[model samples]
Target: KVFGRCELAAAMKRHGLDNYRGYSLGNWVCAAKFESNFNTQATNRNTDGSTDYGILQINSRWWCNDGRTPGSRNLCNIPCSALLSSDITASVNCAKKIVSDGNGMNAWVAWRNRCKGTDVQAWIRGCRL
Candidate 1:
């Protein structure tokens, strides 16, 4: 696991993600909770045959290459396994790119489905940065 909400928030802040690209740290934390529960090794296969990787659950279809997967856009130009590391540097950087691409947190289905209109304060509750 990468971090509990508090630690993750601090780490994100250290990486300049507190208000990165106009999205709040709470949004990212909430999305990570639903996406991968803060586990760096997390991976999920979609019905469409694409796989999501890491805490952000970035997709192989457009973000990272899984090697076995073909026709990936690999916009991050990194291997999928890179995101599975506890360090989270690559994941954070790539996630920023995703946000900069104009998708914001909408790129993550969990964010759209669960965190969109919900009160996200709980995601950072008691987690002093």
Candidate 2:
């Protein structure tokens, strides 16, 4: 659905995340960029020989194939287009829940902490999460 910045911003607004709430639009965009390079169908090659998909980069093998708990353990199995196409906010919200669960995004946040010189806005746009 949303293929670019304006679209992402509008979608964020619709999801109430664009109003400088818990997450910033720039931050969300940056996170998406970092996670999947904005590819709505991106997949990750897991160490256990599996694949993750979409802008959120959820792994389809975990949930769809082996029934591994997605958003709780590995996100390498949640359907990408189904969630992303249906609603970007839901996808993001799903990711947030996973992160809040204290498993996902720890590595990314660690990277952020280490790379202290990166500008927030520019990093959001330029750096890969």
Candidate 3:
């Protein structure tokens, strides 16, 4: 399990993700919540034979290499296992790279389906930064 919402906000701030790549902190928090429920070790196998990794649920098709996934580009150049750790630095850095690739948070389906156009402020409600 990862830290709570407040702790996550603080960590994001410390890692310079408060307003990264023109996206708001609330968007990040909302994405994390829906993607993995703040679980750093979360992994989900897709119907397309791909898998999503970590808090951001990054796809194996473009991000980390899980060995089992055949066409993984491994764009992040990190093992998928690295994303399944309690420490989120690697995941956060890879997510930054992903956003910088011009996809923004749209790279995450959870963000598009659940967080988009929603009142994301509730994700950080009562969290003191």
- Candidate No. with top lDDT: 1
Native-to-model Cα distance after best TM-score fit, residue 128 in candidate 3, in Å: 2.4
Ranking by lDDT: 1, 3, 2
Can you list the residue pairs that collide in candidate 3?
Answer: none
Query: What residue runs in model 2 are displaced by over 4 Å at the alpha carbon?
Result: 19-21, 60-81, 84-86, 103-117, 122-129
Q: Rate the local accuracy (lDDT) of all candidates.
A: 0.87, 0.53, 0.85
lDDT of 3 by residue, 1-129 (tens): 676887887677677777899887888988998898888888899998889988888888888888888866898999998988888888899999999997688888889999988998777778876
Error of 2 at 65 (Å): 6.1
lDDT of 2 by residue, 1-129 (tens): 435755665565567554243445566566666666665756566776655655656554433343443443434344444554536654666556555555445434522543323553653453233
User: Tens-digit lDDT track for model 1 on 2-118?
Assistant: 678888887877877778887788888999988999898999998778899999999998999987667768999899999999888989999999989977778888899999888
Clash count of each predicted structure: 0, 9, 0
Question: Which 10 successive residues of model 2 have the least lDDT summed?
Answer: 107-116
How large is the C-alpha RMSD of every model relative to the true structure? 1.2, 5.8, 1.3
Return the top candidate by TM-score: 1
Off by over 4 Å in 1: none
User: Against the true structure, what is each candidate's TM-score?
Assistant: 0.93, 0.59, 0.92
